[PDB]
Amino acid sequence: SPEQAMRERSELARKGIARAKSVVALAYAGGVLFVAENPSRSLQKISELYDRVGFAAAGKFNEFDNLRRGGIQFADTRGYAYDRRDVTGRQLANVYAQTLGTIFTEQAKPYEVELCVAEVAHYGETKRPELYRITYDGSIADEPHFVVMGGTTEPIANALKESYAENASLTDALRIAVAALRALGVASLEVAVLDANRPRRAFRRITGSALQALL
Amino acid sequence: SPEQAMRERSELARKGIARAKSVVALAYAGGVLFVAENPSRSLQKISELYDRVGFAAAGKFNEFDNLRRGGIQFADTRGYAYDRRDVTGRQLANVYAQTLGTIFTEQAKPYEVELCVAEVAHYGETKRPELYRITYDGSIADEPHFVVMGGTTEPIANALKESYAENASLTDALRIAVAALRALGVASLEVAVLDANRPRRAFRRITGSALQALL
Amino acid sequence: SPEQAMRERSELARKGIARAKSVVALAYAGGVLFVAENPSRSLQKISELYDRVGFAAAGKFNEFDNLRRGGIQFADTRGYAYDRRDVTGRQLANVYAQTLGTIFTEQAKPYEVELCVAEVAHYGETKRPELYRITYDGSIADEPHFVVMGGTTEPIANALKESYAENASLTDALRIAVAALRALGVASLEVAVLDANRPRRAFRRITGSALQALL
Amino acid sequence: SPEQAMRERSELARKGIARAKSVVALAYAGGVLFVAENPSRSLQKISELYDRVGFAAAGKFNEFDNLRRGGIQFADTRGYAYDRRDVTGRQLANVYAQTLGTIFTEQAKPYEVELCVAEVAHYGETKRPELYRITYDGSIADEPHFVVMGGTTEPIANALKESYAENASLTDALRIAVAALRALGVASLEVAVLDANRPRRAFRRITGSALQALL
Amino acid sequence: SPEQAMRERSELARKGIARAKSVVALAYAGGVLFVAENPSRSLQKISELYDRVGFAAAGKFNEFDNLRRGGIQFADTRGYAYDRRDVTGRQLANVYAQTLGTIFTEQAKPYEVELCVAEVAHYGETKRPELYRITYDGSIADEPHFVVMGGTTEPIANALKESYAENASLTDALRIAVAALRALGVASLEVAVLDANRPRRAFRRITGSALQALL
Amino acid sequence: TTIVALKYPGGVVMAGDRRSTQGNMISGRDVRKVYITDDYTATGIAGTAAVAVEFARLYAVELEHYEKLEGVPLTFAGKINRLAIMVRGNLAAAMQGLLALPLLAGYDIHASDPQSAGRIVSFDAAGGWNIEEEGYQAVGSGSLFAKSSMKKLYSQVTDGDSGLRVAVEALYDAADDDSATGGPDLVRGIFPTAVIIDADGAVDVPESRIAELARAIIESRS
Amino acid sequence: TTIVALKYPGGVVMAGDRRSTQGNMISGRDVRKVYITDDYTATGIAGTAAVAVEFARLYAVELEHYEKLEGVPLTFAGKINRLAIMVRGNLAAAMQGLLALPLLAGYDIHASDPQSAGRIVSFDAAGGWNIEEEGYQAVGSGSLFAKSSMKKLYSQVTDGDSGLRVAVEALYDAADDDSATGGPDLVRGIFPTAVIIDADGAVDVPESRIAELARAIIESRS
Amino acid sequence: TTIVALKYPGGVVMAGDRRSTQGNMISGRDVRKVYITDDYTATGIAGTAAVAVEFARLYAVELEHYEKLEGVPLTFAGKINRLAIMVRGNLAAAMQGLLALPLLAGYDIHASDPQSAGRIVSFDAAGGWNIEEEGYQAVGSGSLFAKSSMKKLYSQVTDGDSGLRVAVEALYDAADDDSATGGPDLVRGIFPTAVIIDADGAVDVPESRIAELARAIIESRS
Amino acid sequence: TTIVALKYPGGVVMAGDRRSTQGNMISGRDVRKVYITDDYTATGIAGTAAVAVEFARLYAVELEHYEKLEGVPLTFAGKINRLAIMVRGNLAAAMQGLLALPLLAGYDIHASDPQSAGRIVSFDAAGGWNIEEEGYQAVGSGSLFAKSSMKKLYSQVTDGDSGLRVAVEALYDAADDDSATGGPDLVRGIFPTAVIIDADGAVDVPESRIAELARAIIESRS
């Protein structure tokens, strides 16, 4: 009975992802901001895929680490085959969707992960940043404002929906991010941004005394 | 018991396709018109296969995306092996039918998709446009007037049957398409046509202010 | 329990073939005549295998289409290896029987098809035309007068047995064929003949105004 | 439980072979005579393996046809590797026994066939002809007088045992063969002999007016 | 039911690891100290991976022996590909996590082992030593003070938590290690250290009269 | 060997010689070198005698196989592409001593003007093809003489008889200037073979017409 | 063979000759060597005639395949990279006697200044590419003469007519100094082919303009 | 070695010599070179002695295998195709020093006129086959002399005796003009071997008739 | 081609020429041969022009890939090892005519003394590397003259301006003694390209400074 097996796999994945912490990603005037609850300095949940593409995930570390490595390897080959400016986040999202669907269909145990892909405009141009969400079974959706994955999303989703404001600054949006996640100091917090004013590479981490000053 | 397994797979596929939105395709004086309900600008349900062949589908995105890519790859090789004018939509429909039948028979989970292939006459010639429909198990049928797939087809089928008119213009047929789907502005709507007056390539998208003016 | 599995597969195949329409093939003075109920101009149930061999089938299109393609490929290679006059319909019938038996034994789902192979004498010679019937499990039989496959065969078989006449003309035999199938105009009818007076190729289709004049 | 599966396979094979017609083979002064009940001129149950070896079988046509083709291919290679006079029927019987045993043990469905191999002395020599019988599971036995396979063997076996006579002529032995099978004219009868007076090839078919004159 | 199978495998692994003895690892002023209960001189539970990386495990010997050999082979290749100073314990911990996750997911029986990876700063530098813990299912965590695996951890964990002191000397920390494990002379004890004052290789064993003098 | 082809209003004609030679010794006298591939095309291959018969049979089998598989015949461009691929795939064999130089003539039924629906296609060693626009082409070891004769004689072609006569005259000149090409045989009665393609299809020319034309030419040249 | 390309304010133009030669014998008279690859690029390949037609068709198929697959066209750098890879992959065939020397001209619609959006790219045997900054380039067996003519005639180019005239004059000089390059044919009426790319797209130049320019040049040179 | 074959009304005859030579030293004196392949065909292979015996045995095995498998014998064209493929597959071995030149003679029972049902087929090195229409053919190292003798002696053939006599005379002439071909041996009593195929089948000719014919020819030549 | 590199207190500088030559004909005039691989390294490759651009791009991609994968940049020794492996893997291509001779300059941020953190690494044909201790190195076809000039001019280097001036003078001497190396172009306005690496990172030198230095040197030499 394929229906029963699909049901069991779906409940297994949902129960697996329900355990992990929460990570949010929202768009502000300068780009995209990632905020996550991470007690560890060594193991990281937010990373960089390419010049203008960011990565974020929740769940089991050894799974989305492999997914991130595969995405990086896919991204690097394409920019050598054609060009650096021919790489977009939609292709990476599609690749992730296909991989997750195949894993869910064929593997013995499904991956208990939830991914998100963010992109920003090139230097000197204007464009609305794009956010994608990929679900453990291969489902892909596009979000205009924010993505929340991990733990109990609904209260955080309501808080973010109520208190969201477009074209905000870094301190402002960071404060709603922290407040919504609270509904947390320098430690047990991971913060990264996709800066659209940089010439080539848009990814940088905010840690140390700068995070204390900003928050 | 093979009968029971076939029954379970058939109900699974039917329940999967019953969830998705509806997309219609009808023939008018200038060619074939595609109308679909799509809230997303990024993810598209209607595409182009070759110079005179169009593509349309409903269901899960990551499946008919793979099917479309396979069809495009099949189409391009044939036109290099023999010629560009030796490629017809019947061959693509047959290939899709074989692929869907094999997937339904052998794969662990059947594809919850419904495809449609449309073709138009070459430039300077006359011919009735052809419409084909491929069903998740490999069944193939030919329709003279219109194809409706996705959601609850019967009310839309009745409305289209009652209000259909041959040799209509673009605004006219588009208006019955929109009215039948309603039984929807510029957003949450995807519109594409197969123009038979073009020299080489017959596919073009109607978006922006032109869609507002037409509708 | 192999007996139970064989029973289930046999009932599945029988129920699958019981759904399809009926197609008949009878021998007259000029050769062999094929009559089938086909609403579609595009999808065809009767085809040509070689210079003097014809093909006919009932059931699911995507299966006997593959069988016909395999038979054509087998026929073409032999005539290059040895000669064009060393190809006979008995070899094709044997190949089809082996293929159907292997598919029934090993595949997950048996083919719901019923095939028939017809041959005529070469130009300038005399010989009784041969008719073969291949059944979904690999059974092969030889019929001297006519073969009826698809739907409810028994009433049609009785009518053909009662009203059969040897050395009839084209209009005559066509009229009993149509009457027995009725127990149907130019549309929803497929008619083809194996003409034994032609120099090289004996297959030709009767469509359009000629079918209207003949019937 | 291997015992239960072996039981089911054995009953399946026995029920399969119980359906088919009967074929007998007996030794007379001139060699070995084959008599079979065959309504078809096209499909044959008795064939030739080598210069002095004959073939006969009962059951499903598409299975012993493959077995006969394999035996012919095996026989031809050996006579090229060593010599034409180094080929004996015992080797072919052993090969058939191994093949049938492997098929019964490993295949999904056992073969419902019963084989018999006959050999005669070379030209200018004297020797008693040999008869072998191979059973669907791989069992091999040697018979001095006659072999009966297919249908209900026991009444035919009793009649042949009661009315057998050594060093009989062709008409005589043919008459007991026909009478025992009856317990049948030119049609629905297949007759072949292994003539030991021929220089090189001992197999010839008796059909047409000669069969009428002999019987 | 994948949930039930995961439950059975998890209980099997937990019961397997609950049998073995206990081994502790704590950080002191000079580096990292390993203390284990080992009656055998021949079979060892603590080993060296690279110049600044140590290894420790509990459970079945033939499993973590293979894991240690694989880790050593992985470490040696990287230092030839790039350099000796490009090898860190985090990479080894990630490799172990992936291997254990794959074994737990796909193998017939999961490994009943618990690993720990320790690293120290290079010569002439300052840095806090790092401790990692890898769990039979692939889970990885980072510990700042100490790791206890094997047997009943909770009383030992409480004793170590209560009596821990930073920047202790070798005799001091060794005495709390022995006391916590007791809650044991030269025999039935394995002791090793990662000395950060050595030029190149930081691993050395303390055995014989030196262990008696120290303790 | 020499094969010629030319266009006339409403069709196209092809012709070839009958001589086979192994060095300087004559080994063949009635070799046929022009084949009807399908209803509206004809092919003529020059070079090694063994390779040409294999080549034409393979080409015809391929075309019939595609026709039977897809239910519709190929377009002219598809046939040209298939022939070009077949020629390109034989470069190593040509290097090792198996060379084939084909010539293609056909009638396009899907054209606009029916009076200019004839086509002549020539191929090179590498595998490149060209559609002739001057109206005539020749291949073989005596193709230069035949082409030079047709260049002067092409002004007299108005129909199917004039084209056949001009082709026979060109073959006669090619045989006159080259010893590897065989001329008409009056003692034995062997004459070249010709094929005419028009709106009705490709037909073979009876030997009587060719014999009459050859006799007329021979008596004219005396 | 000779193909020239030059830049004018607001676009770029390409042109080529029509002669094919097998050694010292003329075998082609109306060969086309300039192709429109996509809406804003054109390509011209010199060398073996058979390889160029295959090369351009493969390149166009690749570009259209990428466009259909990803839904967005490639950037100019991606096209250059694909062409460079295609050229690099043919070194062994060039060694064994199949050499192709391509020339690329295009219009960049994603540039800043629209009056300097034209590009000319040249390729070497190994597979290296360079973007011309002098404003003109030529390939073929008579490229040196054409380049030397353009070096002196480039000062007169201000628009699409002057560039076409200069290209025709350079082709005339190249045909004058090299026998493998064919000049204008007044008896038959065969003239070079040209393509103009601007902000609207790539268009073919009608034969009447080229004939008028060639007649003007010929009467000037008399 | 030399093998001859000719046609007479109602059948066909083949014959060959018996000498084997390693350079200039005689190593064989009673070698048989003509074989009966099936009921209505005969084959004769010239060249390396070792390859011919293998060749004929393989050919006979193939024909019998097809007959047994399909239950019907092959047509004549199928046999020719199989032999041509077998010859074509040995080109590398012929290059390295294993050459076989076969000759085929047969009687077609599926023809219209029974008095002209005999066939003679010759093969070339590449693998091409031709059906003789002059009525005779010869292979080997002395085939030219035998062919020239048959060209003059063919007018006397009316039946099976005249054809045998002419074949023996041609073999005698070939042995007279070539040292690699052995003539009749009167001291030892060794004579050529012959096979006659007619509507009844292929039969071997007894040695007495050949001896009588050879004695008659020898006394005539004295 | 010629690329030079030298060390000054607090950094390192690299420079190269702009000429490309096919035999004795000049085919390039503004070729760039010095690339910024990462924030603290620069690379210059001499030899075949096509191979160098591919080489540098592959090297940069490899370094960025490792950085992204492991989250920490490689050490200097790791970069040297990767470059040495890349050079060693091209021996067959160098034998068949694709030779690349790289030069590496960088600044080590993990050293003890910041005033001597600059490094220069040279490579041999086999794949061996050496760290220069004399303070300067040069590669190309005119490297001997540049090295001999630097040997005499190195005593005047105290900062980033003196090193740049000495490098420009060495390039001038190399162009003076070798015809494959291009000197400053006063008519067109083309000057060598330079890169300076210090504690802040690798930066490109504006053309104005190089032009001023070249003019000063030229007026000094007059």
Curated annotation (Swiss-Prot), chains A, B, C, D, E:
Membrane-crossing ranges are: none
Biological or metabolic pathway of the protein: Protein degradation; proteasomal Pup-dependent pathway
- Principal location class: cytoplasm
Q: How is its activity regulated?
A: The formation of the proteasomal ATPase ARC-20S proteasome complex, likely via the docking of the C-termini of ARC into the intersubunit pockets in the alpha-rings, may trigger opening of the gate for substrate entry. Interconversion between the open-gate and close-gate conformations leads to a dynamic regulation of the 20S proteasome proteolysis activity. In vitro, chymotryptic and tryptic activities of the proteasome are both completely inhibited by epoxomicin and by the peptidyl boronate inhibitor MLN-273. Also inhibited by Mg(2+), Ca(2+) and SDS.
Q: Do the record's keywords include Cytoplasm?
A: yes
* Residues annotated with Phosphothreonine modification: 77, 171
Q: Give UniProt keywords alphabetically.
A: Acetylation, Cytoplasm, Phosphoprotein, Proteasome, Virulence
The UniProt entry's GO biological process terms, in alphabetical order, are: modification-dependent protein catabolic process; proteasomal protein catabolic process; proteasome-mediated ubiquitin-dependent protein catabolic process; proteolysis involved in protein catabolic process; symbiont-mediated perturbation of host defenses
What is seen without this gene? Cells lacking the core proteasome prcBA subunits exhibit reduced growth and persistence in mice. They are also attenuated in interferon-gamma-deficient mice. They also display increased sensitivity to reactive nitrogen intermediates (RNI) and increased resistance to oxidative stress.
What practical purpose does this protein serve? In the course of search for new antibiotics, a class of oxathiazol-2-one compounds has been identified that selectively inhibits the M.tuberculosis proteasome over the human proteasome and that kills non-replicating M.tuberculosis.
Q: Where in the cell is it found?
A: Cytoplasm
Q: Which Pfam family would be a valid example here?
A: Proteasome
InterPro entries cross-referenced by the UniProt entry: Ntn_hydrolases_N, Proteasome_alpha, Proteasome_alpha-type, Proteasome_asu_bac, Proteasome_sua/b
One MF term in GO for this entry?
threonine-type endopeptidase activity
Q: Give a short account of its post-translational modification.
A: Phosphorylation enhances proteolytic activity of the proteasome.
Q: How does it assemble?
A: The 20S proteasome core is composed of 14 alpha and 14 beta subunits that assemble into four stacked heptameric rings, resulting in a barrel-shaped structure. The two inner rings, each composed of seven catalytic beta subunits, are sandwiched by two outer rings, each composed of seven alpha subunits. The catalytic chamber with the active sites is on the inside of the barrel. Has a gated structure, the ends of the cylinder being occluded by the N-termini of the alpha-subunits. Is capped by the proteasome-associated ATPase, ARC (Mpa).
Record HAMAP family: Proteasome_A_B
Family, as annotated: Belongs to the peptidase T1A family.
Add the further remark from the entry.
Was identified as a high-confidence drug target.
The record's listing under NCBIfam families reads: 20S_bact_alpha
According to UniProt, the name of this protein is Proteasome subunit alpha
Swiss-Prot record, chains F, G, H, I:
- Pathway listed: Protein degradation; proteasomal Pup-dependent pathway
Q: Name one GO biological process term.
A: symbiont-mediated perturbation of host defenses
Where's it found, cell-wise? Cytoplasm
Q: Name one GO cellular component term.
A: plasma membrane
Q: Cite the entry's keywords alphabetically.
A: Autocatalytic cleavage, Cytoplasm, Hydrolase, Phosphoprotein, Protease, Proteasome, Threonine protease, Virulence, Zymogen
In terms of superkingdom, the source organism counts as Bacteria
What do mutants without this gene show? Answer: Cells lacking the core proteasome prcBA subunits exhibit reduced growth and persistence in mice. They are also attenuated in interferon-gamma-deficient mice. They also display increased sensitivity to reactive nitrogen intermediates (RNI) and increased resistance to oxidative stress.
Biotech application, in the record's words, is: In the course of search for new antibiotics, a class of oxathiazol-2-one compounds has been identified that selectively inhibits the M.tuberculosis proteasome over the human proteasome and that kills non-replicating M.tuberculosis.
**What protein family does this chain belong to?**
Belongs to the peptidase T1B family.
| Complex and partners | The 20S proteasome core is composed of 14 alpha and 14 beta subunits that assemble into four stacked heptameric rings, resulting in a barrel-shaped structure. The two inner rings, each composed of seven catalytic beta subunits, are sandwiched by two outer rings, each composed of seven alpha subunits. The catalytic chamber with the active sites is on the inside of the barrel. Has a gated structure, the ends of the cylinder being occluded by the N-termini of the alpha-subunits. Is capped by the proteasome-associated ATPase, ARC (Mpa).
Designated name of the protein? Proteasome subunit beta
* Species the sequence originates in: Mycobacterium tuberculosis (strain ATCC 25618 / H37Rv)
Taxonomic lineage of the native organism: Bacteria, Bacillati, Actinomycetota, Actinomycetes, Mycobacteriales
Say which residues of the entire protein are included here. 58 to 279 of 291
